[PDB]
A paper describes a structure:
Ferritin is a self-assembly protein cage consisting of 24 subunits with an 8 nm interior cavity. The 4-fold channel is composed of four E-helices forming a parallel four-helix bundle with C4 symmetry. Herein, we have engineered and constructed a gold clustering site at the 4-fold symmetric axis channel of the apo-ferritin cage. Using a series of X-ray crystal structures, we evaluated the stepwise accumulation process of Au ions into the cage and the formation of a multinuclear Au cluster in our designed cavity.
Our preliminary experiments with gold ions using Cys mutants (161 C/165 C and 168 C/169 C) demonstrate the potential of the 4-fold channel of apo-ferritin as a site for constructing Au clustering. Another important insight is that the side chain of cysteine is relatively short, making the interaction between Au atoms bound on different monomers rather difficult. In addition, the binding mode presents less diversity with a common pattern of one cysteine binding to two Au atoms acting as a bridge. Therefore, to create an Au clustering site at the 4-fold channel, coordination residues with longer side chain and larger rotamer space are needed to build the interaction between Au atoms from different monomers.
Numbering used by the authors:
A (entry chain A), B (entry chain A), C (entry chain A), D (entry chain A): 1 to 172
Write the structure that this text describes.
């Protein structure tokens, strides 16, 4: 019943709905990661807050995709949201590894949707991914890689803790 | 691995996890209702915004339950989130009916959790439901009932539209 | 006599001049639509103002294309501007239909210019259309589709008028 | 000589006086814990300040119970206050363990007073415990559990210190 649809393939429409699922699944993973770190026997509030903010960001990405689906005259379709892959998330290092794997999977999904958009000659879709997704994901993955290295440094050794503290207490 | 748990039954712990599922399912229903009203062939932005706000409120209720689960030393466990019951939501009247049915089901779930809390002599749980849930649900259901009556009045007849307009344009 | 031209095909240069014509023709259509709604026997000032603003937006798009033509070292060439397709525009519904047809034709022209830019390996042109045209057109076409649905709802029936008024007077 | 007493059992009146004793005993324990940490050979001022604030909070709880005793027309009766269980409090971990044991004992006393209030059909008493005691105790016990885990993490190992520092210096 759309009167607006133009140059918007059914292939991209379906891929957008799948990507909304993937972003909401990611948001739900981050909600689980955050509340795990809020447990009294884990009790790292900053890590809870880090993942709570990422749950928000992933929800917001899904909402942006849904708004765009309607802007193009496609039909938002929702599927079941699978529960996160784990119920307990181990150490901060374990959790940050799981997060980077998750973000890499979203980034690959964005790249696959660009490939589809390019094959379907859909420049509005490409511009949309560029405006709101591709560089956001690269920045977040770089931050997570930085965090993995610093966690690895801090937990690994005296030299590494000392080097971290110098950066923080003398330079910053 | 909790060192804090006191007077918190495994029955309530499990019921709280189920209620988190129900609230997140409700939030996901409201996300679908809102984006339906944002379709170009439906195009009632105020109804989209009404349900978008309720998606937020239901998410927030789930997050409050999860925070409380950790405060009591229970273990948050997440399950799959089923997709909403419909993909298209009909008219504003259809949608507001579906919303009141949904809110009634959450209210009954809250009342069942009070019954369990009372049976388990858990006054902190009871106080928690009173502080953040029971009156919030009654207020929202009353608002929805008011909206059902006004939608029914507006769509039904000339007399009803005229009466609505008098309230709005002469009295308010 | 340009000393700046680089990677700018004669094909794109010509297509840009044609697109300036199409945008100025659109602006002139909107000027006619707006003054039609200002007639004393039509007298819908809000519809006049809506189309007056679109006349401005289409002029501004043409001016942006002309600035870009000079930035690239092409030569702006102007042709005659044909008068709008009608002298009287019927009802608000008739007019909004004509507007969406017009905007669709501009959007297809933008997509055709992207195809040409891609074939000519001209990424500055592609970036220019993305920055200032493609999403602007999709947003405007979605707004127009929303308006068509609401006009259709309002003129069509009691149920539809009532539903519109609920959104506006109770929710907004 | 009360002219106001209504629905206030002698059982609850006595239990309230006992609970005032328990809260003042707790306040006195916290005063001893705080000044222990202020010793020059212990010298952890933040731990002194943490327990000094809890001494204040426990005094304030006792004063609230006494105000309520008079509001209901019962008679405040004071007994001797026993000295705290230890004269020296060991390490921060030892002290935080002793504190959580203390708070658990107050929480159980509050739950026992709810049981008595419910048996005596005294809803004002129940509302009073809900308003000012039950959730305050759960929040404080959760904070103490968080602190036990972080102390245990910090004192236990290199990995644990590193993880703590990451939360604090990189995330917070
Ligand atoms: Au969290
Ligand atoms: Au947090
Ligand atoms: Au692309
Ligand atoms: Au593309
Ligand atoms: Au630092
Ligand atoms: Au530092
Ligand atoms: Au520092
Ligand atoms: Au919405
Ligand atoms: Au909305
Ligand atoms: Au209850
Ligand atoms: Au209860
Ligand atoms: Au009104
Ligand atoms: Au009104
Ligand atoms: Au009015
Ligand atoms: Au006008
Ligand atoms: Au006007
Ligand atoms: Au292009
Ligand atoms: Au290009
Ligand atoms: Au309105
Ligand atoms: Au209105
Ligand atoms: Au109104
Ligand atoms: Au002190
Ligand atoms: Au102190
Ligand atoms: Au009670
Ligand atoms: Au009671
Ligand atoms: Au810190
Ligand atoms: Au720190
Ligand atoms: Au720091
Ligand atoms: Cl969280
Ligand atoms: Cl299903
Ligand atoms: Cl493309
Ligand atoms: Cl929404
Ligand atoms: Cl499963
Ligand atoms: Cl109870
Ligand atoms: Cl005009
Ligand atoms: Cl000529
Ligand atoms: Cl290109
Ligand atoms: Cl002190
Ligand atoms: Cl004595
Ligand atoms: Cl009672």
């Amino acid at each position: 019943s759309s009167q607006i649809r133009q140059n918007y393939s059914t292939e991209v429409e379906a891929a957008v709905n799948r990507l909304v699922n993937l972003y909401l699944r990611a948001s739900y993973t981050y909600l689980s990661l955050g509340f795990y770190f809020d447990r009294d026997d884990v009790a790292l509030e900053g890590v809870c807050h880090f993942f709570r903010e990422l749950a928000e960001e992933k929800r917001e990405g899904a909402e942006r995709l849904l708004k765009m689906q309607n802007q193009r005259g496609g039909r938002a379709l929702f599927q079941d949201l699978q529960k996160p892959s784990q119920d307990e998330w181990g150490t901060t290092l374990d959790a940050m590894k799981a997060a980077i794997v998750l973000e890499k999977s979203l980034n690959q999904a964005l790249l696959d949707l660009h490939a589809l958009g390019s094959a379907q000659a859909d420049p509005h879709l490409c511009d949309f991914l560029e405006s709101h997704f591709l560089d956001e994901e690269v920045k977040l993955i770089k931050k997570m890689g930085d965090h993995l290295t610093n966690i690895q440094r801090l937990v690994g050794s005296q030299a590494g803790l000392g080097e971290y503290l110098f950066e923080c207490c003398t330079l910053k």
